[PDB]
């Protein structure tokens, strides 16, 4: 079947950790308990933001996920990593 845009992306909804297309830095130290040793010391962009999860989840993930350049993508917490200054 043809790939039709069944879902439409919206701007940053008030009440979020970071903004879409924003580059964050994966914190080295763990705040909750789970952390990525691979990303531990990297910098990626938030592919998905934590927003009202519909009956079909959105946008692409339920939580925020950082994707490193040339690396993979993992799911991190808003209390784990912070928004880079630069």
């Amino acid at each position: 079947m043809i790939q039709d845009p069944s879902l439409i992306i919206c701007h940053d909804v008030d009440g979020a950790p970071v903004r879409i297309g924003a580059k964050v830095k994966v914190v080295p130290h763990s705040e909750d308990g789970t952390i990525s040793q691979r990303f531990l010391g990297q910098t990626g962009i938030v592919v998905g933001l934590v927003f009202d999860d519909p009956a079909t989840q959105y946008p692409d993930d339920p939580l925020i996920q950082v994707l490193v350049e040339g690396l993979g993508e993992d799911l991190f917490f808003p209390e784990e990593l912070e928004l880079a200054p630069e």
Side-chain angles (χ1 to χ4, degrees), residues 3-33:
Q3 181 96 102
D4 51 292
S6 71
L7 213 79
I8 303 154
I9 300 113
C10 59
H11 292 142
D12 156 68
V13 179
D14 216 280
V18 296
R19 204 145 151 173
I20 301 289
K23 176 135 75 142
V24 294
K25 209 223 73 172
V26 175
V27 50
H29 238 228
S30 173
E31 258 66 320
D32 217 316

Side-chain angles (χ1 to χ4, degrees), residues 4 8-9 14 24 34 40 43 47 55 67 69 71 77:
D4 51 292
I8 303 154
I9 300 113
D14 216 280
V24 294
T34 182
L40 170 129
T43 311
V47 180
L67 195 155
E69 193 117 285
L71 250 119
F77 288 125

